[PDB]
């Protein structure tokens, strides 16, 4: 009994989310070491001064949803992995949203967005695990509401972490929420 409004991983790299600023920050990446390609939005501008990198979903039609659940899956590399140059590395990133009746398209104004939470990993990925291709996937969920406008955006702010965002699943929940088969 979940109704899914957005599912990044299911979309196979095709959603073309907005990134700000032009060039520097979040980047759509692919990994093809498994049977099927994996997509993600990654950023890893550690050792590069202050970072303020934004990734914005497309507009999401709310429909009947009043309270949404936002499920994220992501990796974070240990700041000890990088030369002495966390004096220039963080292990969190920030989740934001904004409601609006109309889609503003390519006009992204971060001042319209409210922070939902700081997102922190239960497990950081250390270099030996990274080099062995055993990354530590984290799952975090947050809920937002009550929603009142025709739609909304989510956005992700990186402040200088080494993070890969592999899944963004937004749903609302009806009674009898279970699986089967």
């Amino acid at each position: 009994g979940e109704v899914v409004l957005l599912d990044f991983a299911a979309a196979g790299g095709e959603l073309g989310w907005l990134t700000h600023p032009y060039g520097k920050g979040w980047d759509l990446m692919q990994n093809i070491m498994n049977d099927m390609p994996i997509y993600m939005y990654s950023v890893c501008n550690v050792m590069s001064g202050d970072q303020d990198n934004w990734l914005r979903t497309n507009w999401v039609y709310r429909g009947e949803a009043e309270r949404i659940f936002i499920e994220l899956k992501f990796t974070v590399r240990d700041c000890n992995s990088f030369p002495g140059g966390a004096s220039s590395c963080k292990e969190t990133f920030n989740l934001y949203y904004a409601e609006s009746d109309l889609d503003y398209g390519t006009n992204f104004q971060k001042r319209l967005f409210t922070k939902i939470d700081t997102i922190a990993p239960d497990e950081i990925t250390v270099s030996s695990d990274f080099e062995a291709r055993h990354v530590k996937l984290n799952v975090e969920e947050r809920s937002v509401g009550p929603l009142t406008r025709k739609g909304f955006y989510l956005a992700f702010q990186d402040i200088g972490a080494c993070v890969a965002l592999l899944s963004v699943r937004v749903y609302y929940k009806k009674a009898h929420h279970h699986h089967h088969h």
Partner: peptide, 14 residues
């Protein structure tokens, strides 16, 4: 530089 995820490369649908 460093990558966030092993064996990842920039991707854009064509």
């Amino acid at each position: 530089x460093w990558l966030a995820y092993p064996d990842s490369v920039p991707y854009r649908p064509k």
